[PDB]
Design an enzyme around this catalytic site. Structure first.
Site, PDB file in Angstrom:
ATOM      1  N   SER A  87     104.180 -28.490  54.504  1.00 51.72           N
ATOM      2  CA  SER A  87     103.311 -27.913  53.481  1.00 51.72           C
ATOM      3  C   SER A  87     102.383 -26.834  54.045  1.00 51.72           C
ATOM      4  CB  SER A  87     102.485 -29.010  52.805  1.00 51.72           C
ATOM      5  OG  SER A  87     101.691 -29.704  53.752  1.00 51.72           O
ATOM      6  N   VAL A  88     102.301 -25.701  53.351  1.00 52.25           N
ATOM      7  CA  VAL A  88     101.424 -24.594  53.759  1.00 52.25           C
ATOM      8  C   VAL A  88     100.144 -24.503  52.915  1.00 52.25           C
ATOM      9  CG1 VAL A  88     102.971 -22.972  52.551  1.00 52.25           C
ATOM     10  CG2 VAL A  88     101.222 -22.067  54.130  1.00 52.25           C
ATOM     11  N   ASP A 107     115.866 -18.197  59.823  1.00 48.59           N
ATOM     12  CA  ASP A 107     115.585 -18.369  58.386  1.00 48.59           C
ATOM     13  C   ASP A 107     115.174 -17.042  57.721  1.00 48.59           C
ATOM     14  OD1 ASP A 107     115.479 -19.914  56.011  1.00 48.59           O
ATOM     15  OD2 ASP A 107     113.355 -20.374  56.289  1.00 48.59           O
ATOM     16  N   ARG A 117     112.107 -13.986  50.892  1.00 45.83           N
ATOM     17  CA  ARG A 117     110.977 -14.856  50.559  1.00 45.83           C
ATOM     18  C   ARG A 117     110.115 -15.174  51.779  1.00 45.83           C
ATOM     19  NH1 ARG A 117     115.272 -17.463  50.389  1.00 45.83           N
ATOM     20  NH2 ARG A 117     115.784 -19.301  51.666  1.00 45.83           N
ATOM     21  N   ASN A 118     110.651 -14.886  52.966  1.00 49.94           N
ATOM     22  CA  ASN A 118     109.954 -15.110  54.226  1.00 49.94           C
ATOM     23  C   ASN A 118     109.380 -13.841  54.834  1.00 49.94           C
ATOM     24  OD1 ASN A 118     110.581 -17.769  53.861  1.00 49.94           O
ATOM     25  ND2 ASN A 118     112.215 -17.828  55.404  1.00 49.94           N
TER      26      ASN A 118
HETATM   27  C1  LIG Z   1     104.140 -19.125  56.078  1.00 47.12           C
HETATM   28  C2  LIG Z   1     104.008 -17.722  56.626  1.00 47.12           C
HETATM   29  C3  LIG Z   1     103.126 -16.846  55.743  1.00 47.12           C
HETATM   30  C4  LIG Z   1     101.646 -17.025  56.083  1.00 47.12           C
HETATM   31  N1  LIG Z   1     100.731 -16.209  55.300  1.00 47.12           N
HETATM   32  C5  LIG Z   1     100.640 -16.351  53.958  1.00 47.12           C
HETATM   33  N2  LIG Z   1      99.897 -15.499  53.224  1.00 47.12           N
HETATM   34  C6  LIG Z   1      99.793 -15.608  51.887  1.00 47.12           C
HETATM   35  C7  LIG Z   1     100.490 -16.629  51.253  1.00 47.12           C
HETATM   36  C8  LIG Z   1     100.620 -17.042  49.912  1.00 47.12           C
HETATM   37  C9  LIG Z   1      99.995 -16.439  48.696  1.00 47.12           C
HETATM   38  C10 LIG Z   1      99.806 -17.258  47.579  1.00 47.12           C
HETATM   39  C11 LIG Z   1      99.234 -16.752  46.416  1.00 47.12           C
HETATM   40  C12 LIG Z   1      98.860 -15.415  46.371  1.00 47.12           C
HETATM   41  F1  LIG Z   1      98.310 -14.926  45.247  1.00 47.12           F
HETATM   42  C13 LIG Z   1      99.049 -14.589  47.485  1.00 47.12           C
HETATM   43  C14 LIG Z   1      99.620 -15.095  48.651  1.00 47.12           C
HETATM   44  N3  LIG Z   1     101.446 -18.137  49.850  1.00 47.12           N
HETATM   45  N4  LIG Z   1     101.824 -18.385  51.164  1.00 47.12           N
HETATM   46  C15 LIG Z   1     102.717 -19.455  51.605  1.00 47.12           C
HETATM   47  C16 LIG Z   1     104.161 -19.090  51.258  1.00 47.12           C
HETATM   48  C17 LIG Z   1     104.571 -17.717  51.810  1.00 47.12           C
HETATM   49  C18 LIG Z   1     106.038 -17.383  51.497  1.00 47.12           C
HETATM   50  C19 LIG Z   1     107.004 -18.481  51.971  1.00 47.12           C
HETATM   51  N5  LIG Z   1     108.343 -18.246  51.467  1.00 47.12           N
HETATM   52  C20 LIG Z   1     106.556 -19.863  51.482  1.00 47.12           C
HETATM   53  C21 LIG Z   1     105.094 -20.153  51.835  1.00 47.12           C
HETATM   54  C22 LIG Z   1     101.221 -17.455  51.970  1.00 47.12           C
HETATM   55  N6  LIG Z   1     101.320 -17.351  53.353  1.00 47.12           N
END
Ligand SMILES: CCCCNc1ncc2c(-c3ccc(F)cc3)nn(C[C@H]3CC[C@H](N)CC3)c2n1
Ligand SMILES: [Ca+2]
Ligand SMILES: [Ca+2]
Ligand SMILES: [Cl-]
Length: 256
Positions: free
Chosen positions: A19-20, A136, A140-141
């Protein structure tokens, strides 16, 4: 070894994004940076998954390219947590879908589309030179920087190369295969690869010689580039440095 390790106390975790989680990192310079914190679903009762984790982590902290995400550090609770720059513009996949809506981003010309591709080519050149496998690669990445340049991050059958599906092998050329599939997502502005073709059909489908079909108003030359990424023999596929230069030249031949 454990230089990349950051003290847990400097980190504040917020709402789950993908989970991120979202986070606030406090740096050595006094200021605070917005981060993303991927918690790893990792195997304990065996220090083998954790040792390979740190080993790649340390190698990743030394990565410094405008088209590759920066590994800001690693935290541990015993859950390992990679700390990454937060990108407010999000993944390139969602951006592309959004672009096809009013009120969402403008209509993206081919110049910007190619430019996205070039950026991934540069990130993947850098890694391929450090002998680092992505494993990967998909639209999307790819994250978008604040200046609207694309960096590769997060290093799904429809992105896996034939040899990797058939055998247990994965090299830079398998990554090159994924890159074309990614190239195709960008040109389609977010289509799912292989429409009509299902996940379990993929192996037999690719084994018969069929590859991703050319998008409608997509240049012949760009499909030539992406198709080279899916040649049956991995050794027949171009390196990321070759690809980077073909896209850079093709983009340069298109009007400003
Ligand atoms: C895991 C490496 C990326 C790290 N940085 C990072 N920066 C921004 C985001 C946002 C995000 C969310 C709502 C918004 F309005 C704008 C951005 N979601 N994620 C997590 C996603 C990223 C894309 C991946 N495919 C699944 C996890 C972000 N990760
Ligand atoms: Ca034609
Ligand atoms: Ca041959
Ligand atoms: Cl297709």
């Amino acid at each position: 070894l454990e230089d990349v390790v950051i003290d847990r106390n400097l980190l504040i975790l917020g709402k789950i994004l993908g989970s991120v989680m979202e986070g606030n990192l406090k740096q050595e310079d006094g200021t605070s940076l917005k981060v993303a914190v991927k918690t790893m679903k990792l195997d304990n009762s065996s220090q083998r998954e954790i040792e390979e984790f740190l080993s790649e982590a340390a190698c990743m902290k030394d990565f410094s390219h405008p088209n590759v995400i920066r590994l800001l550090g690693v935290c541990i609770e015993p859950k390992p947590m990679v700390i990454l720059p937060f990108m407010k513009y999000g993944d390139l996949h969602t951006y592309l879908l959004y672009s096809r809506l009013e009120t969402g981003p403008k209509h993206i010309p081919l110049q910007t589309l190619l430019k996205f591709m070039v950026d991934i080519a540069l990130g993947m050149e850098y890694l391929s030179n450090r002998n680092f496998l992505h494993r990967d690669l998909a639209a999307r990445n790819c994250m978008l920087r604040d200046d609207m340049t694309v960096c590769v991050a997060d290093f799904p059958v429809k992105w896996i190369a034939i040899e990797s599906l058939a055998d247990r092998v994965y090299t830079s050329k398998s990554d090159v295969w994924a890159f074309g599939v990614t190239m195709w997502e960008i040109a389609t502005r977010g289509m799912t690869p292989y429409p009509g073709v299902q996940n379990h059909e993929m192996y037999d489908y690719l084994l018969h010689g069929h590859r991703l079909k050319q998008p409608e108003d997509c240049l012949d030359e760009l499909y030539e580039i992406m198709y080279s990424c899916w040649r049956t023999d991995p050794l027949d596929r171009p390196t990321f440095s070759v690809l980077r230069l073909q896209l850079e030249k093709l983009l340069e031949s298109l009007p400003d």
